[PDB]
Design a binder for this molecule. Structure first.
Ligand SMILES: OC[C@H]1O[C@@H](O[C@H]2[C@H](O)[C@@H](O)[C@H](O[C@H]3[C@H](O)[C@@H](O)[C@H](O[C@H]4[C@H](O)[C@@H](O)[C@H](O[C@H]5[C@H](O)[C@@H](O)[C@@H](O)O[C@@H]5CO)O[C@@H]4CO)O[C@@H]3CO)O[C@@H]2CO)[C@H](O)[C@@H](O)[C@@H]1O
Ligand SMILES: OC[C@H]1O[C@@H](O[C@H]2[C@H](O)[C@@H](O)[C@H](O[C@H]3[C@H](O)[C@@H](O)[C@H](O[C@H]4[C@H](O)[C@@H](O)[C@H](O[C@H]5[C@H](O)[C@@H](O)[C@H](O)O[C@@H]5CO)O[C@@H]4CO)O[C@@H]3CO)O[C@@H]2CO)[C@H](O)[C@@H](O)[C@@H]1O
Length: 180
């Protein structure tokens, strides 16, 4: 997409959980299940505000525990998240370090979703004792997502991807250039 970001509506991803998604990089939180997405897909960099992932909804499915490859299941439920946040390259080299020159992370995944624990998404997705997975995602209509957006936290905040057709398309728009 514009900026060199790798923004595909479906693919393979890794998955983790995180705490504290109430003041996220898109500039609005939401009450439903939410995630951060890796920088190369988010469409912005730290401090630059919303990227084009903001507000888009994705169905996530885990099917592998990369730390325990002998585990065959059960996995969690498929969940629908709204992307509200950025998982930056900086400080997240294992999972969110995809760049235009090296577009997969240390698990070979071209995307990563960090699922917010606060609002319940991670408890639906991660079995007890298996807090990091790999699997698939596919962008869906936000008709498939339960929840309500929070208020703007700063000027330029954006979740307009929530009413956009799936990628390829533009809603909030990308900021600057993807990490190289
Ligand atoms: O940077 C992105 C994001 O990260 C968030 O933290 C992540 C973190 O990055 C990730 O490394 C971490 O991964 C955990 C994982 O959650 C956990 O399930 C896994 O547990 C393993 C355990 O280490 C193994 O020892 C055990 O092996 C057993 C075998 O399963 C069994 O068959 C037998 O052989 O016995 C073995 C030994 O007991 O299996 C467990 C399950 O696979 O360990 C991983 C590495 O620590 O997950 C976290 C949370 O998602 C972070 O919160 C966020 O802020 C950040 O943005
Ligand atoms: O008034 C001056 C100027 O302001 C502009 O608006 C600014 C606003 O002032 C800033 O506060 C705001 O800052 C946001 C950053 O742009 C955004 O990148 C950052 O995103 C964070 C996110 O908050 C955080 O949750 C996330 O953590 C991840 C890490 O991987 C781990 O720490 C965690 O465990 O897991 C998560 C997910 O993986 O990190 C990201 C990236 O660091 O959030 C900031 C606060 O929301 O930027 C605004 C835009 O520049 C205003 O537009 C101008 O008009 C005005 O002049």
């Amino acid at each position: 997409a514009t900026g060199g970001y790798v923004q595909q509506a479906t693919g393979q991803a890794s998955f983790t959980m995180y705490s504290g998604c109430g003041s996220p990089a898109c500039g609005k939180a939401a009450s439903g299940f939410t995630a951060a997405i890796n920088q190369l897909a988010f469409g912005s960099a730290p401090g630059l505000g919303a990227g084009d992932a903001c507000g888009r909804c994705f169905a996530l499915t885990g099917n592998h525990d990369p730390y325990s490859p002998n585990y065959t299941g059960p996995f969690g439920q498929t969940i629908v998240v709204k992307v509200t946040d950025l998982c930056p390259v900086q400080g997240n080299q294992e999972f969110c370090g995809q760049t235009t020159s090296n577009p997969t992370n240390q698990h070979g995944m071209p995307f990563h979703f960090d699922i917010c624990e606060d609002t319940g998404g991670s408890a639906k997705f991660f079995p007890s004792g298996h807090g990091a997975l790999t699997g698939t995602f596919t962008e869906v209509s936000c008709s498939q997502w339960s929840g309500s957006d929070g208020g703007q936290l700063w000027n330029g905040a954006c979740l307009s991807g929530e009413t956009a057709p799936n990628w390829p398309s533009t809603a909030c728009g990308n900021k600057g250039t993807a990490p190289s």
